[PDB]
mmCIF file with all atom_site columns, C-alpha atoms and ligand atoms in Angstrom:
data_model
loop_
_atom_site.group_PDB
_atom_site.id
_atom_site.type_symbol
_atom_site.label_atom_id
_atom_site.label_alt_id
_atom_site.label_comp_id
_atom_site.label_asym_id
_atom_site.label_entity_id
_atom_site.label_seq_id
_atom_site.pdbx_PDB_ins_code
_atom_site.Cartn_x
_atom_site.Cartn_y
_atom_site.Cartn_z
_atom_site.occupancy
_atom_site.B_iso_or_equiv
_atom_site.pdbx_formal_charge
_atom_site.auth_seq_id
_atom_site.auth_comp_id
_atom_site.auth_asym_id
_atom_site.auth_atom_id
_atom_site.pdbx_PDB_model_num
ATOM   1 C  CA  . UNK A 1 1 ? 0.045 -0.014 0.160  1.00 17.95 ? 13  UNK A CA  1
ATOM   2 C  CA  . UNK A 1 2 ? 0.961 3.715  -0.544 1.00 16.79 ? 14  UNK A CA  1
ATOM   3 C  CA  . UNK A 1 3 ? 2.141 5.622  2.793  1.00 15.21 ? 15  UNK A CA  1
ATOM   4 C  CA  . UNK A 1 4 ? 1.500 9.305  3.605  1.00 14.84 ? 16  UNK A CA  1
ATOM   5 C  CA  . UNK A 1 5 ? 3.080 11.011 6.518  1.00 15.70 ? 17  UNK A CA  1
ATOM   6 C  CA  . UNK A 1 6 ? 1.655 15.112 7.426  1.00 16.56 ? 18  UNK A CA  1
ATOM   7 C  CA  . UNK A 1 7 ? 3.537 16.064 10.413 1.00 13.02 ? 19  UNK A CA  1
HETATM 8 ZN ZN1 . LIG B 2 . ? 2.790 -0.949 0.880  1.00 12.49 ? 117 LIG B ZN1 1
#
């Protein structure tokens, strides 16, 4: 799957 981190 694809992963996105928005700090
Ligand atoms: Zn993946």
